[PDB]
Amino acid sequence: GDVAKGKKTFVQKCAQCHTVENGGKHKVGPNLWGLFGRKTGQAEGYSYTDANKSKGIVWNENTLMEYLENPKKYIPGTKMIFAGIKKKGERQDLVAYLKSATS
Numbered sequence: 001g002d003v004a005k006g007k008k009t010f011v012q013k014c015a016q017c018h019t020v021e022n023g024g025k026h027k028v029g030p031n032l033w034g035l036f037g038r039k040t041g042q043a044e045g046y047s048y049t050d051a052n053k054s055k056g057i058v059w060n061e062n063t064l065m066e067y068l069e070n071p072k073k074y075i076p077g078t079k080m081i082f083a084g085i086k087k088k089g090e091r092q093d094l095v096a097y098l099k100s101a102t103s
């Protein structure tokens with residue numbers, strides 16, 4: 001159900017870039033393994049200084065709305081090229097997308 005729609009948006013803006021299976025393997029964004037337990041940083045090879053870290057943090061139910069918001073204002077300076085996602089509809093659904101596919 002509304003996790004269907006996350007992967008739809010997932011093949012539309014998150015799909016072609018991240019991998020997704022067990023360590024899928026990097027290629028632009030590392031594997032996004034299991035959002036649920038980790039702070040920003042340390043995931044199997046990183047790269048980069050402030051951003052992601054800098055701010056330094058936690059992946060949690062929130063903070064992915066936090067990010068999901070728009071990568072401009074928030075760890076503001078992430079090297080991931082993104083436009084937006086600044087809507088309740090698509091932004092809610094994402095946060096379900098990562099809790100059904102990631103774990």
Ligand code: HEC
Binds near residue numbers: 013018
């Ligand atoms: C669909 C909207 C995408 C979602 C959801 C995520 N990304 Fe990305 N993303 C990209 C990069 C390069 C990073 C790592 C590099 C850097 O910004 O410092 C990421 C990282 C994430 C993270 C990071 C998780 C962690 O800390 O380990 C999350 C939660 C995640 N992204 C969500 C780059 C790209 C990207 C390429 C163009 C696309 C289109 C997306 N990201 C899309 C999503």
